[PDB]
């Protein structure tokens, strides 16, 4: 399923990478925690520390992120909040 981007402060290349890593994450893992974990760890390695990932069907959030490192999107019913801090 093509991701539905709801909010973002991000460049195109970084966005496509996050979405790709997140789709692959869903095929690998069943638990939301593990899905978030593999996204977070891969981004830390590829783009530097420090990433944080929330994956879920019901949550509200308020966070602070580095400029150009924020995306919030759905893949099917599952929402992904992905962002980087210093």
């Amino acid at each position: 399923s093509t991701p539905i981007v709801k909010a973002s402060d991000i460049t195109d290349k970084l966005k496509e990478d996050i979405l790709t890593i997140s789709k692959d994450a869903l095929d690998k893992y069943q638990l939301e925690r593990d899905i978030a974990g593999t996204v977070k760890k891969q981004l830390d390695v590829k783009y530097g520390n420090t990433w944080h990932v929330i994956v879920g069907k019901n949550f509200g959030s308020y966070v602070t992120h580095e400029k150009g490192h924020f995306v919030y999107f759905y893949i099917g019913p599952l929402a992904f909040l992905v962002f980087k801090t210093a």
């Binding site: 709801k6 909010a7 402060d9 879920g56 069907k57 019901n58 949550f59 509200g60 959030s61 308020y62 966070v63 602070t64 992120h65 580095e66 400029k67 924020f70 919030y72 019913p77 929402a79 909040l81 962002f83 801090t85």
Partner: peptide
């Protein structure tokens, strides 16, 4: 440089 952001799932 940072920004703050709030989000809310639809379900």
């Amino acid at each position: 440089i940072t920004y703050d952001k709030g989000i809310q799932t639809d379900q």
